[PDB]
Amino acid sequence: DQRFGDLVFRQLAPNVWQHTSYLDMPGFGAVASNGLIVRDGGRVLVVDTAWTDDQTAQILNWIKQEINLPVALAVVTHAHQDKMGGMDALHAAGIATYANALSNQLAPQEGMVAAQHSLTFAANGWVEPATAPNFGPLKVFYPGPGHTSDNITVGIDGTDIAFGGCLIKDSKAKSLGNLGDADTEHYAASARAFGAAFPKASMIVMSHSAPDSRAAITHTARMADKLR
Ligand SMILES: C[C@@H](O)[C@@H](C(=O)O)[C@@H]1NC(C(=O)O)=C(S[C@@H]2CN[C@H](C(=O)N(C)C)C2)[C@@H]1C
Numbered sequence: 001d002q003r004f005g006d007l008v009f010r011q012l013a014p015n016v017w018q019h020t021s022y023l024d025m026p027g028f029g030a031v032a033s034n035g036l037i038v039r040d041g042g043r044v045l046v047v048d049t050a051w052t053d054d055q056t057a058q059i060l061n062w063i064k065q066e067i068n069l070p071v072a073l074a075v076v077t078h079a080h081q082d083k084m085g086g087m088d089a090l091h092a093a094g095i096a097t098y099a100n101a102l103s104n105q106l107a108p109q110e111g112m113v114a115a116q117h118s119l120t121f122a123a124n125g126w127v128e129p130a131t132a133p134n135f136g137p138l139k140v141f142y143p144g145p146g147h148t149s150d151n152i153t154v155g156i157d158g159t160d161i162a163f164g165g166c167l168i169k170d171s172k173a174k175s176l177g178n179l180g181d182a183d184t185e186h187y188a189a190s191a192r193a194f195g196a197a198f199p200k201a202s203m204i205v206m207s208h209s210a211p212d213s214r215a216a217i218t219h220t221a222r223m224a225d226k227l228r
């Protein structure tokens with residue numbers, strides 16, 4: 001693990017890093033949140049911000065020191081603080097930001113700064129390529145409503161890695177966490193759709209735990225089955 005300021009970075013693959021930031025909340029202690037950093041040729045791609053602007057700025061600075069490649073774009077997975085809390089740091093650095101169109105619509109109600117561009121999806125859940133230009137190895141998939149209505153997922157081509165965000169919990173989880181904005185009826189199917197969208201991905205990266213196997217997907221879905 002490499003520390004830059006208040007953040008921790010872990011290399012998962014030759015061109016993929018996991019960034020981790022923490023926010024201590026009154027009565028709960030430190031809550032960790034994970035995102036991805038992906039090197040694609042002569043540029044860097046970012047998945048999700050940190051909890052805050054300051055933490056997100058530390059991500060960009062770390063990228064400059066350890067990788068020294070320009071950050072071309074960033075994708076955020078849904079409109080919550082752990083994923084979109086640091087949008088300002090990205091925009092301040094002049095980095096193009098992308099989110100689900102629904103995420104951008106919900107952002108002001110959620111107290112988040114909207115992304116500069118909106119992703120739209122076909123009926124099979126795959127992103128409209130026109131709305132996701134030059135995304136490189138990033139394969140964006142909308143599994144359907146689960147953790148939230150706008151929550152999206154990202155697969156990394158050329159690797160065994162897929163990112164489920166807050167939709168997927170790890171195999172040791174006892175609950176699905178915050179179900180405040182959740183679609184309890186479609187959660188299970190959405191979790192399974194994510195697994196089916198990236199069938200070869202052996203390393204599942206998620207927001208609030210270390211990378212797990214595919215069992216995390218199935219376990220999440222089966223927990224979600226109990227919500228129906
Ligand atoms: C503050 C929000 O970003 C919240 C959310 O996205 O709903 C955060 N993301 C989630 C989540 O469930 O995906 C949480 S809950 C956090 C992870 N689940 C833990 C939990 O509920 N435990 C009982 C450990 C704490 C965080 C507080």
Ligand SMILES: [Zn+2]
Binds near residue numbers: 078079148166
């Ligand atoms: Zn959330």
Ligand SMILES: [Zn+2]
Binds near residue numbers: 082166207208
């Ligand atoms: Zn979360």
